[PDB]
Paper text:
The M protein is an essential virulence factor of *[name]*, or group A streptococcus (GAS), one of the most common and dangerous human pathogens. Encoded by the chromosomal *emm* gene, the M protein is covalently anchored at its C-terminus to the cell wall, covering the GAS surface at high density and acting as an adhesin and a potent immune evasion factor.
M3-NTD includes the 110 N-terminal residues of mature M3 (residues 42-151 of the M3 protein precursor sequence). To stabilize a dimeric conformation, Leu151 was replaced with a cysteine for disulfide bond formation at the C-terminus. M3-NTD crystallized in several conditions with the best crystals diffracting X-rays to a resolution of 1.9 Å at the synchrotron radiation source. M3-NTD is a symmetrical homodimer, linked at the C-terminus by a disulfide bond ([Fig fig5]). The fold represents a novel T-shaped architecture with no significantly similar structures identifiable by the protein structure comparison server DALI. The H3 helices comprise the C-terminal 38 residues of M3-NTD (M3 residues 114-151) and form a coiled coil stem. Helices H1 and H2 form hairpins that pack against each other to form the slightly kinked bar of the T-shape, effectively a three-helix bundle.
Author numbering:
A (entry chain BBB): 4 to 113
B (entry chain CCC): 6 to 113
């Protein structure tokens, strides 16, 4: 057993371990989101309306943040910003190269 | 409206987490059955064909894994950050060239 197959068999095992680790992370997120609400219910009784909202909001905020970390949603928003600046800089570089070509024309004679 | 909308938000987050869990579970199942399929056909293939076959199965799984965990977006972010940095340095260099040209020919 444990052949190479041009490294593809060890790669199969590594991908299997990475998938299992993701499945474990998402399973614990799911389990904990559900138990968070059961815990809220248990402790909800002797909280006022405003404290109830602030408590359940805090639990929801913890789950949403962890989900966006696992699925890369957070990284996609940063990519959006950096891509917009990169696009503006590409247009600025084009404009400056055109300005340099015009300045060569401007001063061709002297 | 319903614990200030936090109860419906809990249910929404629950459905979004369950959808990710289902996607990762199907990816896991299919990666493992892909190998059982490979094992079944491995016998009748040469070394080159074995590598090409298992590589194709691995490529499928890795692409989907990197989609679900956002690794594909992180790699693209790395490249776009480096292109943005290169362009900022190119803007600076081009402005320097323009200022030098202007100074060179100020008497012209």
């Amino acid at each position: 057993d444990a052949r190479s197959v041009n490294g593809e068999f060890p790669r199969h095992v590594k991908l299997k371990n990475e998938i299992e680790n993701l499945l474990d992370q998402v399973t614990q997120l799911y389990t904990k989101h559900n138990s968070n609400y059961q815990q809220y219910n248990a402790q909800a009784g002797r909280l006022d309306l405003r404290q109830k909202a602030e408590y359940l909001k805090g639990l929801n905020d913890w789950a949403e943040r962890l989900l966006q970390e696992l699925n890369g949603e957070d990284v996609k928003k940063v990519l959006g910003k950096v891509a917009f600046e990169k696009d503006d800089l590409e247009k600025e570089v084009k404009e400056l190269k055109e300005k340099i070509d015009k300045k060569e024309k401007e001063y061709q004679d002297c």
